[PDB]
C-alpha cells in the first residue's frame with residue numbers, strides 16, 4: 001500500500017508520533033516522503049555493506065530488524081524485517097520510535113539531513129487536519 005499524504009499524517013498522529021522525542025509530525029512526514037514515497041513495501045539493498053532498508057521509514061537490517069542475511073547485525077526493535085513491509089504500520093512506527101531513542105535522534109537517517117533539516121516542512125501536513 002502507498003499512503004496518501006493526509007491519510008498517513010492522521011495515522012501517524014493517532015500512533016503518537018507528534019512531538020515524539022521532540023520530533024514534530026511534519027518532520028516524520030518529510031522523512032517518510034523522501035525515504036519511501038509513503039510506500040510500505042519499499043526495500044533497498046545496499047550492495048556496499050550487505051544490509052537492506054525496509055518499509056515506509058527505510059529501517060536498516062544491520063541494527064534494527066532481523067532478516068537473517070545481514071552480517072554482524074543486531075535486532076534492536078526485536079522484529080523480523082518482514083513486519084516492516086505490512087500495510088498496518090504499527091510495528092514500523094514502534095521501531096522508528098526506538099531508532100530516535102538513540103542520541104542522534106531523527107539525524108540517524110541521512111535523507112532527513114539532506115531534505116528536511118532547516119527547511120520549511122509545514123507543507124507535508126497542511127490541510128490534513130492534524
Ligand code: NA
Pocket residue numbers: 060061062063064065066067070073074075
Ligand atoms: Na539485524
